[PDB]
Amino acid sequence: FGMQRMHYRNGDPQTPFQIAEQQIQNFQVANWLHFVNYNQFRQVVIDGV
């Protein structure tokens, strides 16, 4: 999208995916970026464990 190189400071509380989710105008690319941003496990208890 012809954007800046994004000088990204080491120690930013947000990962580069987590600000590419808000800098980018497209839906599709940014929708997949937001799946990756807050992708995590479900903490489940099946069969005691």
Partner: protein, 397 residues
């Protein structure tokens, strides 16, 4: 109580903020609170109702968390959110109707229903959210004993008291003297009458006085003070003090000479107003003293001089009135007024489910009998039930 307001505030915001197509950053801080709420409320069972015709309902919470992975909220997320929100809204509706219906003489500020006594633990303390409404702010400030203020538009501080007083009377009831008044809602209409029009009073001046004690101390009150009380200005027949006979009252209206309106706090004159009408202000008071007087007009045209003879038959009776209407006032205790509907919600819940008369509140929730004897235990019960009514009025429209 704090967690009940927190449940209702999150459910209100999650009906408002979680909509179809909205951006995730608009709701990114609400979904975390709603997930904390789901995590806290799972595994717990509740039981609401059981008094009057309010039915016993059992509540079991087994819900999955909401997703945190969308960029724009699609309709799947909105529909599963609407399901979880509708179940929690039904739960908090029945908890609020279970709490407004109960009362206690011993300590009314404590929760009385089983569900709100169960929610008052520290296990449920992580539900807690912002406390931004006026009633929950004054709840949290009076839970630490600080000064509060409820802002009322036309507060119902006066009990209904329509009566009179005869300073001069006889069984003929043809030469009377004294005051009449109507105290209703936020309005005092007073009228002192003399049948002789001060024809034998010293200096042709008859002094009237009307002292209204309040039940709670009002603060920063805007008050419309007008002369010429309109209700006591037309002819009427009135029963006597013992209710035996009736007497006739045919008023002609003089203007009130030498109006002195004093606003007493603990017997000390805080504000005073001498012959000033229109809008007045009273900064701190719990007693209103109206001191107006009737002066016989020394110059009268022949149309006026036939009204007031020196002899006994007075077919036209001199009458002097005032009107005092509290438009808005800040009171530390809870009241009812013309703006909120909280008393209406409390009475609607207590009358819909056919609730027996308990130890504290008057039968039928008579506000006149509730503000006539406004005890501090009844004050605590009224504040608690009004706070729960405000919570339910946030959720249930």
């Amino acid at each position: 109580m704090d967690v009940l307001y927190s449940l209702s505030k999150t459910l209100k915001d999650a009906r408002d903020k979680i909509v179809e197509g909205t951006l995730y950053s608009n709701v990114s801080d609400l979904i975390q609170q709603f997930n904390q709420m789901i995590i806290t409320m799972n595994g717990n069972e509740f039981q609401t109702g059981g008094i009057g015709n309010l039915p016993i309902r059992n509540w079991n919470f087994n819900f999955g968390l909401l997703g945190t992975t969308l960029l724009n909220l699609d309709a799947n997320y909105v529909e599963t959110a609407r399901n979880t929100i509708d179940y929690f809204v039904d739960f908090v509706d029945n908890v609020c109707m279970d709490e407004m219906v109960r009362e206690s003489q011993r300590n009314g500020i404590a929760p009385q229903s089983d569900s709100l006594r169960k929610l008052s633990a520290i296990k449920f303390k992580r539900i807690n959210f912002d406390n931004s409404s006026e009633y929950i702010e004054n709840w949290n400030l009076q839970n630490r004993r600080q000064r509060t203020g409820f802002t009322f538009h036309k507060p119902n501080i006066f009990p209904y008291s329509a009566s009179f007083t005869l300073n001069r009377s006889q069984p003929a009831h043809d030469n009377l003297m004294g005051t009449m008044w109507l105290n209703a809602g936020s309005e005092i209409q007073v009228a002192g009458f003399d049948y002789s029009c001060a024809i034998n009073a010293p200096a042709n001046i008859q002094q009237f006085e009307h002292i209204v004690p309040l039940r709670r101390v009002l603060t920063t009150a805007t008050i419309t003070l007008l002369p010429d009380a309109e209700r006591f200005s037309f002819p009427r027949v009135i029963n006597s003090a013992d209710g035996a006979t009736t007497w006739f009252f045919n008023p002609v209206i003089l203007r009130p000479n030498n109006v002195e309106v004093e606003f007493l706090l603990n017997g000390q004159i805080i504000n005073t107003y001498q012959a000033r009408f229109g809008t007045i202000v009273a900064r701190n008071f719990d007693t209103i003293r109206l001191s107006f007087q009737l002066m016989r007009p020394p110059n009268m045209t022949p149309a006026v001089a036939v009204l007031f003879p020196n002899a006994q038959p007075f077919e036209h009776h001199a009458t002097v009135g005032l009107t005092l209407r509290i438009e808005s006032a800040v009171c530390e205790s809870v009241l009812a007024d013309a703006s909120e509907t909280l008393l209406a919600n409390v009475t609607s819940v207590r009358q819909e489910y056919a609730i027996p008369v308990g130890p504290v509140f008057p039968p039928g929730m008579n506000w006149t009998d509730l503000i006539t004897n406004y005890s501090p235990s009844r004050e605590d019960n009224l504040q608690r039930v009004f706070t729960v009514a405000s919570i339910r009025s946030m959720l249930i429209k």
